[PDB]
């Protein structure tokens, strides 16, 4: 029997690691073969088509939507052994009031911004805690290195790489400042999107002042490691997970990680948390028990550790004696709270693609910042 498995993993390191775990399983389980697909930027649409057809892979990544999008398609995992080791922070995300456990997490999100620590030290820059401090850090980097380095780098041929910027900054913009937020209108379903303009404007000024890569619209995730590894990049969104690979290329580099900065004075930064890579079992799998056996195999301390190390993402289980990759900085920001992804819990499914699409067009010049907010509103209403 062959089990189908789908994953949102796009990093060669992590994908191979997953593959070799799948292989170790196959060699310990005679009847059972595992085929894994990694469609990356096309993942979410492929799974929407599979849900609509009700023809799901046996194992599939839920990538932040286990309950809200995939819930009806998932088998209940609550009786599996690994469950007692789930980091409590994920309890409300992967469990419901019935006791159901919707998916198994390979890791979890703790997303901010990654930077070249040695470069920041060279320009007398502390890690920015506000958007405005970030913009100033970008300006210093540019003029101080005299244009040698790209202050903030985005693989903008990939929509998600741009959506990511908006999605993270929406939190401090619209949610966390209890004096300036839009939770009520978001929970009404009446949010008008005027605030969102600030984000699009910010990105436009970043390209206006050459604070980002000029090849942003053509830049691909492939190219990042190379440039970080040769000290031509100040900042990237932490989700690019390049610290493992760039170290393997150049062990001299001191990278740091910092939370997503605040937008309004008085507000604090936030880590953005929740699911990153998960595997759920299709409720209607013909090999339910085999599919769960893969998960049980994968949840062994050793394989948790393998998969943990293949990224810089923190671990999801409490059972691993291993420290998180950036535990050093996390101690330094023990004060900072964790927020869920803005699009995962405050928006209907669909807004992520619009976020990324409109990020591209802003950069290409097809839309002004105001017209970006307008497209988001239009699509947000359409989704209700
Ligand atoms: O991050 C918030 C986002 O989370 C879910 O999105 C799922 C996501 O899956 C694919 O990307 C996963 C991929 O992300 C990283 O890689 C890149 C390049 O660094 O970053 C982009 C996302 O910011 C991504 O498109 C690029 O591949 C990460 O390093 C890697 O480990 C991950 O496997 C897909 O490409 C992307 O578009 C998304 O569909 C969630 O569904 C979203 O709603 C949102 O909350």
């Amino acid at each position: 029997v062959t089990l189908t498995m789908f994953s949102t993993m796009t990093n060669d390191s992590e994908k191979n690691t997953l593959r070799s775990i799948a292989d170790d399983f196959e060699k310990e389980n005679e009847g059972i073969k595992i085929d894994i697909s990694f469609p990356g930027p096309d993942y979410e649409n492929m799974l929407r088509v599979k849900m609509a057809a009700n023809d799901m892979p046996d194992l599939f990544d839920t990538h932040g939507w286990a309950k809200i999008r995939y819930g009806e398609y998932t088998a209940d995992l609550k009786d599996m052994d690994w469950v007692k080791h789930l980091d409590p922070n994920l309890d409300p995300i992967l469990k419901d009031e019935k006791g159901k456990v919707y998916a198994y997490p390979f890791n979890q999100a703790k997303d901010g911004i990654v930077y070249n620590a040695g470069l920041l030290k060279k320009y007398g820059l502390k890690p920015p805690q506000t958007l405005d401090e970030l913009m100033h850090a970008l300006e210093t980097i540019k003029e101080k290195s005299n244009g040698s380095v790209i202050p903030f780098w985005f693989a903008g041929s990939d929509k998600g790489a741009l959506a990511q910027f908006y999605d993270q900054l929406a939190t401090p913009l619209l949610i966390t400042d209890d004096r300036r937020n839009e939770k009520k209108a978001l929970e009404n379903g009446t949010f008008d999107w005027s605030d969102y303009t600030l984000l699009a404007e910010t990105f436009k000024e970043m390209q206006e002042k050459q604070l980002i890569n000029k090849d942003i619209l053509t830049a691909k995730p492939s190219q990042l490691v190379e440039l970080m590894a040769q000290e031509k990049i100040g900042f990237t969104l932490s989700v690019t997970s390049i610290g493992p690979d760039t170290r393997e290329v150049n062990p001299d580099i001191q990278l740091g990680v910092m939370p997503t900065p605040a937008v309004y004075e008085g507000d604090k930064p936030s880590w953005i948390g929740g699911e990153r890579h998960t595997v759920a079992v299709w409720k209607d799998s013909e090999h339910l028990e085999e599919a769960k056996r893969f998960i049980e195999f994968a949840a062994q301390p050793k394989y948790v550790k393998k998969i943990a190390e293949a990224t810089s993402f923190p671990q999801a289980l409490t059972n691993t004696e291993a420290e998180n990759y950036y535990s050093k900085f996390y101690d330094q920001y023990e004060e900072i709270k964790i927020e869920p992804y803005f699009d995962r819990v405050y928006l209907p499914s669909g807004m992520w693609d619009v976020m990324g699409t409109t990020g591209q067009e802003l950069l290409a010049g097809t839309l002004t910042p105001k017209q970006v907010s307008e497209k988001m509103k239009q699509e947000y209403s359409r989704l209700q």
Side-chain angles (χ1 to χ4, degrees), residues 242-255:
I242 55 64
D245 290 354
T246 195
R247 227 83 142 200
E248 169 80 64
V249 171
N250 179 13
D252 284 2
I253 302 200
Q254 299 132 216
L255 300 174

Side-chain angles (χ1 to χ4, degrees), residues 7-11 14-15 38-45 48 61-65 69-70 107 109 111 153 155 158-165 167-168 220-222 224 236-242 272-273 275-277 310-313 340-345 349-353 355:
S7 173
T8 62
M9 288 182 190
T10 62
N11 166 253
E14 66 187 347
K15 289 192 282 165
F38 301 98
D42 290 335
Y43 188 101
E44 293 191 37
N45 283 335
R48 289 192 193 96
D61 195 342
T62 57
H63 58 79
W65 299 82
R69 189 181 307 168
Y70 296 101
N107 49 30
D111 303 346
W153 195 93
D158 178 69
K159 282 165 177 177
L162 303 180
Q164 188 70 38
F165 172 85
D167 200 16
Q168 286 182 236
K220 302 193 185 176
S222 307
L224 180 46
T236 190
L237 289 178
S238 70
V239 85
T240 56
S241 201
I242 55 64
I272 314 300
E275 317 173 28
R276 176 50 64 199
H277 303 120
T311 73
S312 55
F313 302 141
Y341 268 100
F342 178 66
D343 79 305
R344 289 183 192 175
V345 302
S349 286
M351 287 303 95
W352 170 254
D353 196 19
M355 236 168 253

Side-chain angles (χ1 to χ4, degrees), residues 305 308-309 311-315 322-328 330-331:
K305 198 187 276 163
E309 294 170 356
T311 73
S312 55
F313 302 141
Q315 302 167 97
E323 306 299 290
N324 295 322
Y325 182 59
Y326 282 118
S327 301
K328 182 159 49 175
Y330 302 154
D331 293 351

Side-chain angles (χ1 to χ4, degrees), residues 26-27 58 61 67 87 93 106 109 127 135 140 163 186 231 274 288 308:
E26 288 173 14
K27 85 173 216 140
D58 295 293
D61 195 342
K67 296 174 68 182
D87 174 358
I93 303 314
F106 290 115
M135 293 302 295
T140 319
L186 291 160
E231 322 254 38
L288 205 88

